[PDB]
Structures are given as structure tokens and as C-alpha cells.
């Protein structure tokens, strides 16, 4: 849900120590995602993946 994405976003903003750097990482990840998927929306999947990787 939207709320879930909002909690995951907040979760990634913390433990990163740089909101800009983690926004750049999310952008890059989502770009790669859509690129290797054209072969859900990229930024959303990127945030889901990065949250699930933070264990």
C-alpha cells in the first residue's frame, strides 16, 4: 500500500546518513530495474527491493 511505501521510504532515509545519496541510489536502482524489465513502477520496486535488502 501507499502507507507501506511511505514507511519503507522513511526506513531507507535513516541508516543512510545522506538523504541525497540514498535518493541517487534509489534513482539508479529504479533505472536499472526498468531497463532490465522492458526486455508496478520502477521507483516503487526499487524502494521495495532496497527495504527488503536492509534486513
Amino acid at each position: 500500500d501507499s502507507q507501506d511505501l511511505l514507511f519503507k521510504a522513511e526506513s531507507l532515509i535513516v541508516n543512510s546518513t545522506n538523504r541525497y545519496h540514498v535518493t541517487l541510489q534509489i534513482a539508479r536502482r529504479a533505472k536499472q530495474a526498468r531497463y532490465e524489465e522492458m526486455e508496478i513502477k520502477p521507483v516503487l520496486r526499487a524502494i521495495l527491493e532496497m527495504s527488503d535488502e536492509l534486513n
Partner: protein, 46 residues
């Protein structure tokens, strides 16, 4: 998290609401503060 809320047994003006929002942000984060603000908005409107 882990910070249990205090039972505010008093009248709630704007100052009390602002204090509660600040406490929620300080202890719980920015998305639980958003949720609390939405819930308080719904309750007040009702």
C-alpha cells in the same frame, strides 16, 4: 518506537496538539507522525 504514550487526562488546545505532534516525531519517526496527524484531523472533524 518502544515509547508508550502518556494518557493525557486534560483539555487539548492547539498547544497540546502541537506538543503531541512534536513528541510523536521525536520518538516514532515522520510517517507515524503523519499517521497521527491524519487520525487527529479525522477525530477533530468528526
Amino acid at each position: 518506537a518502544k515509547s508508550a504514550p502518556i494518557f493525557r487526562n486534560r483539555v487539548i488546545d492547539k498547544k497540546q496538539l502541537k506538543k503531541l505532534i512534536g513528541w510523536t516525531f521525536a520518538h516514532y519517526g515522520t510517517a507515524k507522525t503523519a499517521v497521527v496527524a491524519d487520525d487527529l484531523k479525522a477525530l477533530g472533524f468528526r
